[model samples]
Target: ADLKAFSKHIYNAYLKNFNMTKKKARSILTGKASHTAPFVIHDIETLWQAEKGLVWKQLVNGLPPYKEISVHVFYRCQCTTVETVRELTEFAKSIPSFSSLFLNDQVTLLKYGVHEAIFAMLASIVNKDGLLVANGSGFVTREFLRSLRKPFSDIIEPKFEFAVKFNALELDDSDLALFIAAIILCGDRPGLMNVPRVEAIQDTILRALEFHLQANHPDAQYLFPKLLQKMADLRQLVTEHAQMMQRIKKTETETSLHPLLQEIYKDMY
Candidate 1:
């Protein structure tokens, strides 16, 4: 298949779904030159699906794309911000119940994406700076089946609704930042299947991380998410002991790990 056609079709699909303008779509389709901004078709196959470079006609097989694809995206840079989120929420509120399926789904995804992106961004900021008073109220994963359960359960579910929570350390901030930036550039391709897969896996990983971190530091009044816990765990596992849970017993860790202990034993002790 013609590479240009393949790319254009995928791009058009995104534009039509999101109701985006042509100029914006075209720039995203062809707006990268280097490692940072260039939209190299090299990753299109990986992102969509084409076994051989010169043989596959269109996005087939439905496997996920390479990680590099997200790195070159410009949409997030071009249009997303805290204000954009507020506007989207306002727009959703205005839509009547008589709206079409397209409008509802479109609005739903956009709203969720904005929240998720913010969640990921805040978490990243904290991971880099260690303590930035980050919050995870941004992006939340609400299970769709809340409405699908029995009627009696529905009444109970509303009061006890379950939502997956995230913390700063639960995700790879750099990776998440890049992913959102890419989604903005490419628009989220839902049909790829990888999107949900990636999200679910991340949720599980982040939850575990949050639990451990909370256990270790009970008094900290931070909105610590599982992502941060996982990051610390990985850092300890990778740099300290690839196969073991050896302690980061350095003096710095000793001082920071326990503020009470440090206070109890001054230089004299």
Candidate 2:
């Protein structure tokens, strides 16, 4: 496939489906645009109110501390994260070359790569100010999160640190299409039955990404290299996240991680 055509086709593929952007979401959250302002959590009480009358009664191991807003917001993060997983899955399937690879290669790539992709996209929606929650229908301040107690508070700050730097690169949706695809198709991932085939797939994606970056970001230099470094940073973040998840499982036994995430965590640690 011609490089120019291949890049644009991939661009158009993801561009058509997902509509929200970090810029627009920020505008809405910051009141720069005229929309019903999202529910904002500047402190803990409002966060507790967020879960009111909701039906998750099945936490049979649950007790008094489990009722805390800190736990609920983390629960909120879990639900929000699950939706992102599906979106990334759809984005992955849309790539012209991905469906052809399918088989175990598909499952294997997702097993290893999904969290990396999630945090990459997560960087887009967050800043030092706060993170958008409830799919941008709600806002949670960074300080508000910092005010939180113990392990819960510690977990998010690390991600916020990563997002603070990642956002400065200022990639747009079209740019992100190939970026996320690069994450999923990375050849370095273990457990692939067809190593050479996967490597060949990732090779074309990197070339397309480099060419696209040059064409779209004509004034910029070395963006592709910087992006590779960012992906390396992403792997490290996932490793830390695994350790934190292990901590929560051991210490906060009142809550259970959702099965989908638990499955991924199983291999990661």
CA-lDDT, candidates in order: 0.30, 0.77
- Reference-based TM-score of each model: 0.20, 0.87
- Candidate with the greatest TM-score versus the true structure: 2
TM-score, candidate number 2: 0.87
Q: Model 2: runs farther than 4 Å from truth?
A: 16-19, 29-32, 48-65
Residue 189 miss distance in model 2 (angstroms): 1.7
Candidate 1 lDDT over residue span 1-269, tens digit each? 34333233333333333332323322333433212332122233432332333222444423222233222111111123333354434433322221233453444344334443333333332211121110211111122223222332232232121111223223332223223322222124233223453344334334433443344446654625433343333223222221111122232132122232122122210
Q: Give the clashing pairs for model 2.
A: none
